Symmetry: D2
Subunit: 403 residues, 4 copies
Amino acid sequence: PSLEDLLFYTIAEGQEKIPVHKFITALKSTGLRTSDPRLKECMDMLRLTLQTTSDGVMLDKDLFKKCVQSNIVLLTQAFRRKFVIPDFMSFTSHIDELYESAKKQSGGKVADYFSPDLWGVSVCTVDGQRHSTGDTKVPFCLQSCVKPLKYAIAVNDLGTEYVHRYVGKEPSGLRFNKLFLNEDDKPHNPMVNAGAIVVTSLIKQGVNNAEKFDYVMQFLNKMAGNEYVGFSNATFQSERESGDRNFAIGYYLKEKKCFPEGTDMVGILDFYFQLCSIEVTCESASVMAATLANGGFCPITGERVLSPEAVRNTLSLMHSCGMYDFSGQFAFHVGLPAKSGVAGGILLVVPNVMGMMCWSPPLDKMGNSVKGIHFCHDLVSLCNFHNYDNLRHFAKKLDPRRE
Amino acid sequence: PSLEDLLFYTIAEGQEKIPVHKFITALKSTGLRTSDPRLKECMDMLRLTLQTTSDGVMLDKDLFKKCVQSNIVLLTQAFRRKFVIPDFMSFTSHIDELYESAKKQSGGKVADYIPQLAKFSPDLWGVSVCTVDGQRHSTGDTKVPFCLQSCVKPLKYAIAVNDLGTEYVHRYVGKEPSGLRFNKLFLNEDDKPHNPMVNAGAIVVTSLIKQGVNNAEKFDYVMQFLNKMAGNEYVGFSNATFQSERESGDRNFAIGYYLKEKKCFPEGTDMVGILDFYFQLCSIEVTCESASVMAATLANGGFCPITGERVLSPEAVRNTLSLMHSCGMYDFSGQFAFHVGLPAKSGVAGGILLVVPNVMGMMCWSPPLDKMGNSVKGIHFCHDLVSLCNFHNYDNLRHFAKKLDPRREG
Amino acid sequence: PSLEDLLFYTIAEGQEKIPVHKFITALKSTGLRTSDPRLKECMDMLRLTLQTTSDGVMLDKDLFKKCVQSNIVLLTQAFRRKFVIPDFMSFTSHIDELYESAKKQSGGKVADYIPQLAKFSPDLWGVSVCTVDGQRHSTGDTKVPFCLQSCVKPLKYAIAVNDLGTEYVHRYVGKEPSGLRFNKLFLNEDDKPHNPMVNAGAIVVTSLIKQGVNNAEKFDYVMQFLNKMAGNEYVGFSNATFQSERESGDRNFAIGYYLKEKKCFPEGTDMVGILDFYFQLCSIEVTCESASVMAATLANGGFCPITGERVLSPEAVRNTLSLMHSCGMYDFSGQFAFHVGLPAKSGVAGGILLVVPNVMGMMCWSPPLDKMGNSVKGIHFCHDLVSLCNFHNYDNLRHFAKKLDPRRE
Amino acid sequence: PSLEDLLFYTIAEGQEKIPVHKFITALKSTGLRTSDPRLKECMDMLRLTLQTTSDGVMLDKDLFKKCVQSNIVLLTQAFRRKFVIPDFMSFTSHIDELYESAKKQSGGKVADYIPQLAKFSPDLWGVSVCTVDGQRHSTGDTKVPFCLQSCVKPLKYAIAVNDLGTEYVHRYVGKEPSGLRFNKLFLNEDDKPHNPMVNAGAIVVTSLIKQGVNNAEKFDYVMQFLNKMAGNEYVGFSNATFQSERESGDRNFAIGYYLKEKKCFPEGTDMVGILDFYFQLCSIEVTCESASVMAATLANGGFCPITGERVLSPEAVRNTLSLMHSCGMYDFSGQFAFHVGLPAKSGVAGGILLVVPNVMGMMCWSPPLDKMGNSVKGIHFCHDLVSLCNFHNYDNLRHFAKKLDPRRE
Ligand SMILES: O=C(Cc1cccnc1)Nc1nnc(NC2CCN(c3nnc(NC(=O)Cc4cccnc4)s3)CC2)s1
Ligand SMILES: O=C(Cc1cccnc1)Nc1nnc(NC2CCN(c3nnc(NC(=O)Cc4cccnc4)s3)CC2)s1
């Protein structure tokens, strides 16, 4: 036997040669993208062999074999339907319905401190299967969607028990919404501004703020498989002009000796405003999400980006603390680690399956995207993705993991 | 072909006979117990044909075919290692090390506020495992009865959601943890108790089961309900604890009257009776083994693993596991949800009902409590368990560093 | 000279005899009432001498002299305009305007939660004054009995401190206002109720009076105590209010059970009994006149102004006036202390027991409550009173702008 | 007759002439000081005619007459024992033992969080009295300058209310104590600070004084005001403390930013500048003698007792006394209001601005603080003071048990 050859006969049909368009539509139908970085060597060798001629072009058994031999292990598993969602092409048609029925919820206010009709969802599974619907490629800032990401970096570089010398691990209480510190004089959790600010003070001490920002950008690039990550100076300067609450928080933390020694608080706050003005798209962000869904390995490159300890802690606190005052209601009904931001984003993680990012700017009165919240409810109302759904007895729900 | 076609010829060895002890030690090493109710028909025909014929006593394939034919589906996936934990004999050897490593934790105080919990020796300590396929294991003081106390709150919440639905129940009780000092308030800001796992919410949930009927039938209804969760293993009642809970309970009488004034019960409720039904549900008796099957029922989407019976709706089980995650270990719940990530529920007798979804249910029991109300040995065992297996709610099933995955063997 | 004789010459005009009607209207304009108890030796001797003959009936200087001689000390100060309010008849006419300007305040709802407080007309309204010298005045429905309800908490707290002292009593109850919503917590952080003016603290204070003795004698002792505080004017009891309060009081039962687990009572307490005693104490009946004398007793350092009897220790009167200042009007207590500055205590029947220390006691009553539980017309009257006289606790007695000062001439 | 002979009566003793020391010792024994500003015309003419005449030197009846003629009203009231405390020499001797008995109280920590406060020996301790008539007395370290710190909060609140009225000021600041674990919240539920005596509320009051003007005139305007409140005795400024407060004040910067975010200031407020104006007002310096005259102005309905000038409106003085009563001693306010019953305000330098309305103002000072921030010797002196005289806000002015009443003999 030869595993490059018998994949050739899976796609060949019995016909003696394989056209290359038939290979790319068979591939794009697994849900992989032909621009997948784990597919570079194979797609290099196929642009190479269509300069060779231009009369077709079908591939022999040795030509297909020498196009795919260095990527066949990932390609067989794709074609023997061994990915986390085997029937990926049906699943996106459900994503499309969930997207389109959430598209009809017009209500909400867009943050004013900017079209209210943008709405996009993007999926990245832990195997790299991708799909998008709507305005999936318009940049927007993470705002508070960065709080799990910089927390993950902090825990990765420093460990849990150092990070949680400075910030708690529990939800406030649905009217300790207003206190900055718990009773041990630590912020409640990394997902509120006070805790996020302290987490930002922990990343890359000893070096100046420009290199700190670069290190987080490098880190976010690995999480997104080197897809789109940018920076909006406009939101930066407007958050730097409007942040009297974050300035109040910084002065309270300084006096209560809540930062690591040698901290410049007023600078840390400017670093904090930079990190909330970082730009993503729904597609780039969904890869970040899928990195957390995949135990710390980026799904479209295979690179270990975050330690399992960071990814677990981050998923744990997005569960309890991730959707502002709606976190309890959200944890009960949806049961997924999620994190919302005031541009309208919701970074969503279905552990061991997929990462998601949906984005629509109109917010509900608790600060969460209306359409995003609607989509998340519908998704778990249709598939056994809820954290405490049973994988064997699940009533009317769908399990996209099965055939 | 068929399937006995090859289950017998699987372990037969090639030899045309299986001695019956070699079949039962092969069975008991899967971790099933020969008294498993789904093995009733098969074990009867082996007791019988060890009377029909007693000179062997080996089994032909045509004799083995009539012992296992009505239990064959469970016996092949039992023997083709398709149970959730395939190498069960290694797993229990880990359970044993974690049991013996928590056994050295001296600390804690036994609950004394009633004389009937101060009679349980502080040196008792038992853990029991019931996986979702019926595999069992026990170590320590595992057949000793003790009262559920607040381990019963998730069980009765699940009963209420099953019979009444999520939206009726939660007109009367919330779905979030207090806040680590709204732990003292009886009501959240919508004038509902915070969640079913605290005393005020448990009392209100008790108010919802089996309305219109008197307390004797209400209790019977919950007891048949708990009997099915436990696969008809031991469920009892300690009248000694009930009478002593009934007059040391001024806290719950304070709660009951506040809830009446704030009109938190359903119409037509006799609150002082509800308080007596509530004191009874907290005196229900289990052992670690019985309770571990109850837990495994929540681990199995609502089906009891040792009978195959549907006991709770998936919506009830999911709601109950959701609220045990956030609110199940008193003030320690946030830390527990972070570090352990398993749905668990603590009681003042020393129990910790533990559920690892899709894998197993557990009950650990040691009476000494830490200052927050949780069994010290349980808390340590739970911490040690998750530090050794990728059972945490947000461990990854593919990349888990040095941890073990007993759902795998390679 | 002589003290009975010069006064005859103050009242005589120069005339050789005094008609006895001219003497009693001269006396009633002092503001004293002819039924004043410190005045009965004198009013006995005038009923005696209008049997003599009924053909006159004027008094010589020796006939007037031994009618008034055993009450002469009180009548000279009365007629030498030495009472705390010398021009009492202008003051009542000001009190009359305050009564009539509050009569136009319609709002409020009458309590329903007992069919005994919802039977009361929404238009009854009375104010009564008893000064620390005994001068009396009333306007409106001042002789209609109604229940003290929570106006009794300062009274029983005073009894408690009188019998046991401040340091014993405040082992069980605090001395401060909670905070404008720690109003919903039962206990402060030392596991004592916040202060005797909230139900939790009132319940605990009820547990301190007359321990060891059964509830029937405990109730008798408090009634004797209230009898002295009111100069033996009207004190009654509504069993209708009692039984309806005792079947509707689920919050008060919640409170007692909570205080019991938290070991808040003195040892040997039967908690469920104490709640029944607490419900009895809130069904005690007064009128605006009877209650105003109780108030005037607190205004007068513990002496009842119409009998001269020491009723409460000065230590009890100060503590009770302090906590009525801080804690006496439910959620309005801060606003009330700021604007009115008078120790007051409101109850759900519509009463406001009000004290102007060193001057007068008052009780006003109108059943409609505002959204915080206080009588609308009572609250309005109290505001106007201090907006017109320098009675506010931190008004200056020398520089007070346009306010009136009824203690001066 | 007229007042100058009848003064010449009493002072003569029978002699036909008065030695001038004998008049001055009789004058100093009323407790007036010969430097009292209302007495300067009399004292100039006595210094003058002790140049004119070196002949004795006693004063004839016309020599006494034209020295006291322009101050004769204040000297007869002084010499007819008509001042609020007539036996001033017995009273100060009581003040002396109260001071000496608090001198034995070892405890407390000197505020050290700024080096300008560690430099104050923990053994300085002074109390000063200014009665509402100008009578003065001091014991201990009463001429040592120290900063008002938070004793300035009632003073600037009084300035704001005098210029702006109660209803404008309290659009931005409440009227109640927080609650004794709302020690940490900045705003009550209407998004106003709880009251002017906490840091957030004081900061907001600083927003209201002299808006539209820059900080230099704003400060000058407040300094005029304090000068007149102290009858032009010592009011200074510690620039050393100001720089250390603007350097350590992240909690006030935390507070300023929170108040900015919730629009608690008036439109057009520069908040970080208001924080600098607030740090200046806390470094204003007094001594115990200077400050005690400030206190007496609040004791006197807005008139400074040693100059006769109207400085604050009666409404300002009442509001400020009300809130010092409830909120002026940090977390100890409820205990203090209960046990002491006097308007007081403490500061972290160790001062306690104290007011006994209608009688006297005081400032006590010893730098060691107890764990709640109040001067240990001050709190003790206050307890002893009210445990000795019927000055408590709700003591009775007629029935006060064994306590002393310095307004009587
Ligand atoms: O603990 C201590 C001492 C302390 C003090 C300070 C800090 N630490 C400790 N004080 C206590 N006194 N009483 C207690 N038990 C009471 C049960 C009866 N009450 C309620 N229970 N639940 C209630 N719900 C609501 O208020 C609803 C609501 C409405 C609006 C907003 N939020 C919530 S009111 C009061 C609590 S605790
Ligand atoms: O909300 C409003 C208005 C309101 C009032 C009432 C009801 N609803 C709304 N008031 C507010 N005032 N200030 C606010 N902002 C922060 C809270 C005060 N500070 C703190 N931050 N964290 C803190 N915690 C600790 O004390 C730790 C601790 C110790 C003990 C117990 N528990 C906790 S204190 C900084 C400013 S909000």
